[PDB]
Design a protein around this ligand. Structure first.
Ligand SMILES: *Cc1c(COP(=O)(O)O)cnc(C)c1O
Ligand SMILES: *Cc1c(COP(=O)(O)O)cnc(C)c1O
Lengths: 858, 858
C-alpha cells in the first residue's frame, strides 16, 4: 500500500514472500499488456465506448471516439510510466527537476501516437475500420491551457527531449483551470474569454488524490537571530493535490512525468454557516483556495494581483520542493549527498522562492547548520535567464513579501548579509559595488528584493538562451556578479525545438520526403538531426525541387482550409494561383517592440502604391508585375490592458476589410488574422509558410524559438539582426536569410537623434501615416495614438528608420519567390539541411553534460 | 451524429446503407461485448489501471481499483443503456417521466454488480485474483449527494423498479455539487460541511456536454389578455447541462436513465473584468449560475433564498420539460397525442411549475389554443402528494413569483379564472367556495399562489402515498377539489422500496438464505416478492430460525465494525454479547415532530432508571434483567437553523457521553450517533436492525419508506399508528408490529387541552426534564428550550401524551427480543414473508396501470 511511484528494491524482496503463490499467479496471468497489434487497440477502444462511456456503435460520435481512444492510449502509457518510475527508484540516479511556471503542452493524442514503441498508421488503420477518421477525432482535443508564450513552449520541448533521452526528469507546474484566457476577435477587437479546456474532464491526467501537500501563508515566526531553527506559525493553509501527466519519448519506452498542482481548501464546506443562511460564506474558503490555480499570469497591476502572483509562485515552489525532498528521504541517504542526487533548474525567475524554501526546511525542520544547508542549496540550483532589458527583471516589495512570507524574508536578509560580507572581503572599500550587487534594493520608499540577484547567489550555474544573449548578460545586467563569481558560473545553451512535434507531427508530408530521399524508413534522422545535411546533395536536381515544392503547396492548402473553416465555410484566400501566392506570416505576441505595426505599415504602403498605379492607367498585368500575389497572415494575442497592442489588432482587421474586399486589385493582396493562435494552429500555420517575419527592433530579443520552427519546415526569414536570427544565419548561411534594418549599435544613437536632433519621416511612411489619420470611417481618428507615437514621441522602436530597408528587402523577396523559384527552393532545402543544431535534444545534451551532470538511466 | 439516445428506425434503415461494408464489418468485429466471463472483467480492469489511471500493479491501490472497476462496469452498462434507449425509440411506447427534486441514489457500484445479466461473484472472483478485495474497493465510493430524505429515496427506488420492469421511464433532477450538506458532529454539535461527493470525479455519469438547455429568469411579458401567445423577454439565462446516470434493472438488460442537470453560466469567464483588475466580478456570472445547483434545499428563510428555491425549481422544471418535449417531437406525432405518449409524474409540489410551463410552451411557443393546450396539460400530469398538514403546502408570494416568473404568473391567473368559472357554474352562488378553492390566495398583504391547488387543477390524477393519506387529502386539504372534480381523480398508490438494494444488496446473507430455502437459485423472488410468503411454512422450524438469526448477527457485526472504524479504531459497542444486544435504531431527520426527543427522553429515562437502580443496590444482573443490553443507534441530520433540532443532536451526544462512559452500567446501554447518515450507512444500519423507531406524533406522517426497509430485513417496528405503519400493519399483520401512542382523532383535542385546560406532565418525563435542566456541566441550562416547549408551551407534539405508552411498548420489545427470540424471529420471518407488497415493483405496476396507462417495452 502507500507508494505510487516505486518500491525500494528491499521492500519488494520482503513483501513478495508473504503474498500467497496463487494470488501472485492470478495477478500475473491477468496483468495488462501493451498493444502489440491494431486488434488490441480496437478491443480497448470498443470496451471503453461500451463500458466507460456507456455508449454503442449507434451513438459513438467523434467526441466519444476521442474520449475512448485517449483513454486507451493513456492505459498503454500508464504501464510504461509505472515501469520507468520503478526503474529510477530501483536505480537511484541523479534526477533533474525542471520548474516552470508554464508548460505549453498543446494537444497530447497525436504526439502519443508518434512516440509509441511496439505508430500512427496502425492506430489510423484500426480507427478507420471502426468508422473513424483519425483527423476528425484528433480535432476534438482542447489544447492544454497550461502555458502561454515561448517560455512555456521551451519547457514543453525540453520535457519531450528529456523523455526521449531517458534522462530522469520531472517537470513541476500548476494546473490552471482556465488557461491565461482565450481570444475571440469581436468586431475587429480582441475580447478575452475563459479558456475552458477542462470542460469534459481530461483523459490524459492521473489525479493523485493521495498526494496532498499543505502550504502556508501569512503568520509569524516565533523563535521565542534568524540563523537558528525558528518556528513559522502561519495564518492560512491551503492544499496542493497533484495531477500526473505521463510524457512519452521517441522510440524509448521511458515515460517521464509532469506533476501539476491544483489548490484546494482545507475546509471545503462549512455547514454551520450554510445552516445559518450565510450561504456565501459557507463556501468562502473554497473560493479563496481556488484563486491560486484558477488563471495563469493573474493581473498584478494592483496590490491584490501582486499578492496573488507571489502567493501562486510560493504554492508551486513549496509543494514541488516538498515532493522533491520526500522522494529523497526514501533513499535514506545523508543530506550531504542531496547535490549529488537532485538537480533543480529554474526556468526563469518565477521559481526563485524554491531556493529560500530549501534553505528554510533544511534549517527549520531538518535542523542543519545554516552554513551547511546553504552549501547544499547552492550546489542544487541552476538558473536559465531569458531577459535582456534590466527593467523586465522581477522584484518584490518588502512589506508585501514580508507579510505574506515572514520567515522567507528573514532568510533573504541573512543570505544577502553573508553574500555582501564575501563581496567586501573580495573588494575592500568598493562602497558602491555593495549597493549595486545587493539582493535588497534600497529604494524610495519601498525596498525591493531583487529576485534575479537572489537566483544568481543561490545557483551554481546561470545560463543565457543564445550565445549573444549570454555574452550580453555577462556584459550588462550581471556584470558585477561576473566580477565576484568569475565567468565560469555564466554559461550559454542556445534554445531549440523538438523535431517530433515541429517536423514529424506538423509536417508529415515533408517527413516522408526526407525518409524517402535519404532512405531512412525508421525516421532515425529525428534522433540524429545531423544527417539532414545530406539533403544538400540533392539541391541541384529538378525532380527533388519539384517534390519539395509540392509538399509546401499541399501544406498551404491545409492552412487555406483552416481559414475557410474559421470563416464559416467562406474562403478568404483565392485558391486558384496558390503556387504563385507568397504566404507571408507574423504569428506571435502582439507587442509594439515586435513591430507588427512596421509590418502593417508596409502592407498599407504596398496597397496604396498598387491602387495609385491602377488609377494612373497601368493594367493589372503591370501592377501585378511590380507587386505580385501575396497573403499576409497575422496571429497572436495582446495582453488585456495593453491599449496600443489592442489598437494594432484592430488596425490589422481594418486593413484586411478594405484590401480583401477591393475588387480593383483583383486578389493580388489579402490580409488574414487567425484568432486564438495556440500550438495546434501553429502546427498548421508554420509548415505552410513561404516567408515568416522576425522583425523586432534590434537588440530586443534574447532567442526566439518559432523562428527555428519556420526554418525546420523550409520557410524563409525576413528579420532583424537580433535574437535567434543571428544563430539561424550562422548555421544555415547568410545567403539564405533576408536581413535588414539597423543593428544594435546604432539603436541608442538613432533613438537619441529622434528626440534631441530630429530628422523627418520618409515620404513612404508619411503616406501611410496620413492615410490612416486604413480609412476607419466610423471613427476617423481611432488610430491616432499609434501615428503620434512615431510622428511625435521619438519613435522609440525605430519604425521610421527601418521602413525603407524593410520595403527594399520585400522587393527582393518578391522577385526571388515569384520569378526565380529554383533559387527560392534551394534556400528552403538548405534551411532544412542545416536546421539540426536547433533540435531540443542537443539543448538537453548540453544541459545534462555541463550543468546537471546527469546521465540517462534507460 | 447528434442523437444520443436513439435513432428513429427509419433513420437507421436509411443510414445503414451508406456505411461501407468494411467499416460496418470492422466496427462489427470490434464492437464491444459485454463481459461474459471473469477474464473479461479482468482485462477491462487491468487496462483501466494501466491506461486510464496510468498506474501499475505496484501502485494500484483501492481508490485506484474502484475507479477502474467502476469504469469497467459503467462500460458494460453503457452497452445496454444504449440498446434500451434505442428500443424505446424504435418502439415508441408511452413513456413515464418522473420529476423529482431529489433522488437519493446512494452508491452505484454494487447495485450494478447485482443488476448485471450475463454477478457479484464473478466480479468478486476476478478482483480477488488481481489483488483486490471487492469490499475494500466498494468503500471508496462517495454516496451521490443528489437527494436527502425519503422523497428522494422514493424516487430512487422507483427508478430501479421501472428499470427492472422494462417500463419506459426517465427521471429528471438536479446534480447538486455539494449535496445538501454533510454532517460532522464536532463537539457533539452538528456542524454542517460541504458534501464533497464529486471530489475525485464520478465514474458513473455520462456527462452529456451535448445536452445544454437555456433557462430564463426575470424579465417581462410583452404581448404587446393573457390567453394569447405572449412573449417572455426574460432578464437572466443560465444553462442546464445534462448528466446521465444509467439505471440497471434486475435480470433485464433494460437500462433506463436518470438525467440530472447542472447549472452553468452563459458566460464562464469575463476577461474584460479580469483584465481591469476586477477579478471578483470577472467570474461573477459563474458564481450566480452555480448557485442554482450548488446546494440542495437552499436556505429560503429570507428573500434571497425564497428566490433561489423558486429559481432552482423553475430551472429543473424548465430543462426537463424541454427535454421531454424534444424527445416527443422526434415522434412527429400530433400534440393531441401527447397525453397518449407522455406521462409526467410530479413527485410532490416542487415540479408544479412544469404544468404552467407545459401550458406556457404549448400556448406561447407551440401556439395551441389556450383551451386545447390546457386539455393536454391536464391529461399529461399527475401529482403525487406527500403532504399532510396544509401549512407545508407550497405557496409563493405574487410579488416574488411575478418578478422572477412574469408569464407564468399570467397563466396562473388565467388557469385560476376559468377554474373558478367552472366552479361557479357547478355551484351557483357559492361565494366562499370560490375564495377557498382558488389558486390565488388573497392574503394580507402578499397574495400567494397556492402551488398544490395549481397542481390539482393541472393534473388528471392526484394520488396520495398511502391509502389513509389519500383518504385524508380527499377529506381535508383538497375537499373542495373533490367536490368539483369528483373522487375519481384522487387515487392512492402506497409507496414501497426496491428489493435489490434494500434486500439483496444490503443483506446478501439473507438473500442467500431465501434462495437456499425456497430453492430459488435464480433469486426469482426479487422479481416476485409474492413468493416470499412460502417462508411462512418454514417459520415453524428451528434450523431455519437459527439460520435467520445468524444472518442478523453477522449483520450486526458489520454495523459494529462501522462504528469502530468511525471511532478511530475504538469500539463503542461491546462485541462480546452482541447476539443479545438489541439494536434499536431511529435513523431519520431530526425534527421535533419525528420525536427523536421522545426517544432520547426515553433513553435518559431508562438510564436514570438504571443508575438509580444500581445505586439502590441492584446487581447488574438485576438491572440488566429489567433493562437489557441495548444500543440505541441514532442517525440523521437537522436542518441548519432548526435550533431545537440541533439541540436534540447535542442532547443525544451528551447522553452518549455520559452513558457510554459510565462504567457502572457495564455496557448495558450504549447510545451511538452515526454521523452523516446517508444510504450506505443505511444499508449497513438497516439489516443490522433489531428494532427501528417510527414514532412521530399521530397524524403527521404520510407514508414512510425506511419503515418498509426495516421490514424487508426482518427488523421490527415500534411506531405510532400513523404513516406507513398502518399499511405495514395491514400486510404483515398487527401482531408483528409494536404500535403505541395516540391516534389522530385524539390529537386535536389533546393539543387543546394542553393549553386551555392543562393537565400535568407524567413524572417519568418530569424526571428526565429536570435531569437535563443529561447534565451538561459546562452550560447547565443549555437544554432549556426543549424542556420549556413541553413544559410551558402546550407540548404541541404530544411527547407528554405518548411518553408512557412509548415506554410501555419498549418494555414489550425488550422482553420479546431477549427472552423469546423464537417468537421474535417468527415476527421477523413473517415480516419478510409479507413485506412483498411494499416492493416498489408493485408501486410501479399500479402507477403504470391506473395512472400512467403504460405497458413495459422489453
Ligand atoms: C513556438 C511557439 C511559441 C514561441 O514562439 P516565440 O518565437 O517565442 O514567439 C509561442 N506560442 C506558440 C503557440 C508556439 O508554437
Ligand atoms: C430510506 C431512506 C430514507 C427515507 O426514509 P424516511 O422513512 O422517509 O425517513 C431517507 N434517507 C435514507 C438514507 C434512506 O435510506
Amino acid at each position: 500500500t502507500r507508494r505510487l511511484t516505486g518500491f525500494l528494491p528491499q521492500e519488494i524482496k520482503s513483501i513478495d514472500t508473504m503474498i500467497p503463490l496463487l494470488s501472485r499467479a492470478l495477478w500475473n496471468k491477468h496483468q495488462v499488456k501493451k498493444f502489440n497489434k491494431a486488434e488490441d487497440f480496437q478491443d480497448r477502444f470498443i470496451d471503453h465506448v461500451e463500458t466507460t462511456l456507456a455508449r454503442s456503435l449507434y451513438n459513438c460520435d467523434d467526441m466519444v471516439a476521442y474520449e475512448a481512444a485517449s483513454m486507451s492510449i493513456r492505459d498503454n502509457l500508464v504501464i510504461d510510466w509505472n515501469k520507468t518510475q520503478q526503474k529510477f527508484t530501483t536505480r537511484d540516479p541523479k534526477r533533474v527537476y525542471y520548474l516552470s511556471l508554464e508548460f505549453l503542452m498543446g494537444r497530447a493524442l497525436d504526439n502519443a501516437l508518434i512516440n509509441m514503441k511496439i505508430p500512427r498508421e496502425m492506430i489510423k488503420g484500426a480507427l478507420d475500420e471502426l468508422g473513424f477518421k483519425l483527423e476528425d477525432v484528433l480535432d476534438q482535443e482542447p489544447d492544454a491551457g497550461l502555458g502561454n508564450g515561448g517560455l512555456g513552449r521551451l519547457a514543453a520541448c525540453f520535457v519531450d527531449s528529456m523523455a526521449t533521452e531517458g534522462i530522469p526528469a520531472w517537470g513541476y507546474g500548476l494546473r490552471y483551470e482556465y488557461g491565461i484566457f482565450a481570444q475571440k476577435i469581436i468586431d475587429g477587437y480582441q475580447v478575452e474569454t475563459p479558456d475552458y479546456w477542462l470542460n469534459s474532464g481530461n483523459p490524459w491526467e492521473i489525479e493523485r488524490n493521495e498526494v496532498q501537500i499543505p502550504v502556508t501563508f501569512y503568520g509569524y515566526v516565533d523563535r521565542p537571530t534568524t540563523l537558528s531553527a525558528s518556528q513559522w506559525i502561519g495564518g492560512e493553509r491551503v492544499l496542493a493535490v497533484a495531477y500526473d501527466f505521463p510524457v512519452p519519448g521517441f522510440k524509448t519506452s521511458n515515460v517521464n512525468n509532469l506533476r501539476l498542482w491544483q489548490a484546494r481548501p482545507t475546509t471545503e464546506f462549512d455547514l454551520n454557516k450554510f445552516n445559518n443562511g450565510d450561504y456565501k460564506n459557507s463556501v468562502a474558503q473554497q473560493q479563496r483556495a481556488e484563486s491560486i490555480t484558477a488563471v495563469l499570469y493573474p493581473n498584478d497591476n494592483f496590490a491584490q494581483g501582486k499578492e496573488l502572483r507571489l502567493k501562486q509562485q510560493y504554492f508551486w515552489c513549496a509543494a514541488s520542493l516538498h515532493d522533491i525532498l520526500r522522494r529523497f528521504k526514501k533513499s535514506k541517504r545523508p543530506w550531504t549527498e542531496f547535490p549529488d542526487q537532485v538537480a533543480i533548474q529554474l526556468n526563469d525567475t518565477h521559481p526563485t522562492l524554491a531556493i529560500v524554501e530549501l534553505q528554510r526546511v533544511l534549517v527549520d525542520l531538518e535542523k542543519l547548520d545554516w552554513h551547511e544547508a546553504w552549501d547544499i542549496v547552492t550546489k542544487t540550483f541552476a538558473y536559465t535567464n531569458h531577459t535582456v532589458m534590466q527593467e523586465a527583471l522581477e522584484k518584490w516589495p518588502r512589506r508585501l513579501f514580508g507579510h505574506l512570507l515572514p520567515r522567507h524574508l528573514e532568510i533573504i536578509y541573512d543570505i544577502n548579509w553573508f553574500f555582501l560580507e564575501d563581496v567586501a572581503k573580495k573588494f575592500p572599500k568598493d562602497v558602491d559595488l555593495l549597493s549595486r550587487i545587493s539582493i535588497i534594493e534600497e529604494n524610495s520608499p519601498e525596498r525591493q528584493i531583487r529576485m534575479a540577484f537572489l537566483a544568481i547567489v543561490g545557483s551554481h550555474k546561470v545560463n543565457g538562451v543564445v550565445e549573444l544573449h549570454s555574452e550580453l548578460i555577462k556584459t550588462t545586467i550581471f556584470k558585477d556578479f561576473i566580477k565576484f563569481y568569475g565567468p565560469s558560473k555564466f554559461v550559454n545553451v542556445t534554445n531549440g525545438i523538438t523535431p517530433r512535434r515541429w517536423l514529424k507531427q506538423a509536417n508529415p508530408s515533408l517527413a516522408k520526403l526526407i525518409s524517402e530521399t535519404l532512405n531512412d524508413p525508421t525516421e532515425e534522422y529525428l534522433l540524429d538531426m545531423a544527417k539532414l545535411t545530406q539533403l544538400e546533395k540533392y539541391v541541384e536536381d529538378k525532380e527533388f525541387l519539384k517534390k519539395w515544392n509540392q509538399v509546401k503547396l499541399n501544406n498551404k492548402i491545409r492552412l487555406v482550409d483552416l481559414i475557410k473553416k474559421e470563416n464559416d465555410g467562406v474562403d478568404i484566400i483565392n485558391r486558384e494561383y496558390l503556387d504563385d501566392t507568397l504566404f507571408d506570416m507574423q504569428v506571435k505576441r502582439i507587442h509594439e517592440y515586435k513591430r507588427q505595426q512596421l509590418n502593417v505599415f508596409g502592407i498599407i504602403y504596398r496597397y496604396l502604391a498598387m491602387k495609385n498605379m491602377l488609377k494612373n492607367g497601368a493594367s493589372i498585368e503591370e501592377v501585378a508585375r511590380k507587386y505580385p500575389r501575396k497573403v499576409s497572415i497575422f496571429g497572436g494575442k495582446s495582453a488585456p490592458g495593453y491599449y496600443m497592442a489592442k489598437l494594432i489588432i484592430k488596425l490589422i482587421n481594418c486593413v484586411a476589410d478594405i484590401v480583401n474586399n477591393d475588387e480593383s486589385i483583383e486578389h493580388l493582396l489579402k490580409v488574414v488574422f487567425v484568432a486564438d493562435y495556440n500550438v495546434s494552429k501553429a502546427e498548421i500555420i508554420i509548415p505552410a509558410s513561404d516567408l515568416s517575419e522576425h522583425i523586432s527592433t534590434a537588440g530586443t530579443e534574447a532567442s526566439g524559438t518559432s523562428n527555428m520552427k519556420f526554418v525546420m519546415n523550409g520557410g524563409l526569414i525576413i528579420g532583424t539582426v537580433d535574437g535567434a536570427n543571428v544563430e539561424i544565419t550562422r548555421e544555415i548561411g547568410e545567403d539564405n536569410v533576408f536581413l535588414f534594418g539597423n543593428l544594435s549599435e546604432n539603436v541608442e544613437e538613432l533613438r537619441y537623434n529622434h528626440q534631441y536632433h530630429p530628422q523627418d519621416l520618409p515620404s513612404s511612411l508619411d503616406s501611410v501615416l496620413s492615410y490612416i489619420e486604413q480609412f476607419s470611417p466610423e471613427n476617423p481618428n481611432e488610430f491616432k495614438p499609434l501615428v503620434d507615437s512615431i510622428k511625435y514621441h521619438g519613435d522609440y522602436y525605430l519604425v521610421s528608420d527601418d521602413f525603407e530597408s524593410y520595403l527594399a528587402t520585400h522587393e527582393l523577396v518578391d522577385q526571388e519567390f515569384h520569378n526565380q523559384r529554383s533559387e527560392w527552393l534551394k534556400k528552403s532545402v538548405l534551411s532544412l539541411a542545416n536546421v539540426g543544431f536547433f533540435s531540443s535534444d542537443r539543448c538537453i545534451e548540453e544541459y545534462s553534460d555541463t550543468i546537471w551532470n546527469v546521465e540517462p538511466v534507460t
